[PDB]
Ligand SMILES: NC(=O)N1CCN(C(=O)c2ccco2)CC1
């Protein structure tokens with residue numbers, strides 16, 4: 383566990399994280415994909431061996447000794463708001479289980495279903511609150527990675543409000 387488990391946010395490429403494992407915003411088929419998933423495929427392509435897993439689940443594949451946790455959020459283009467919300471919460475609960483099982487002291491996480499799976503909505507608060515619901519009971523240092531200065535500020539505000 384981390385000595386004083388914390389949440390932080392950084393606006394940078396999650397493929398250049400400084401944590402003991404990474405969460406991929408994966409597709410269900412284990413394809414290279416685009417956005418975070420493509421950056422993860424270029425950095426850790428060996429982790430895409432048998433990485434296919436259903437929506438609402440996470441599957442860990444090692445790249446050397448570095449764990450890549452493939453977490454499959456729902457595509458809100460396809461899911462109802464209600465079913466999409468259930469599967470997004472479920473994907474984060476499976477991430478918490480895998481982080482615990484691995485025994486890591488830190489994890490790099492993206493906000494699931496906020497990019498091309500957002501169905502064109504702003505889901506910062508929805509996705510972050512499900513991340514907190516799952517990760518609050520873990521003792522790993524969590525570092526959230528984002529790709530927008532306004533998102534960085536809003537995530538940082540949300541973290542600080544609880545402290
Ligand atoms: N995780 C991020 O930092 N992203 C910031 C850029 N994004 C948007 O601005 C966006 C897409 C749909 C509605 O807002 C995607 C999420």
Ligand SMILES: [Cl-]
Nearest residue numbers: 393394395398
């Ligand atoms: Cl970067």
Ligand SMILES: [Cl-]
Nearest residue numbers: 496497498499
């Ligand atoms: Cl996405």
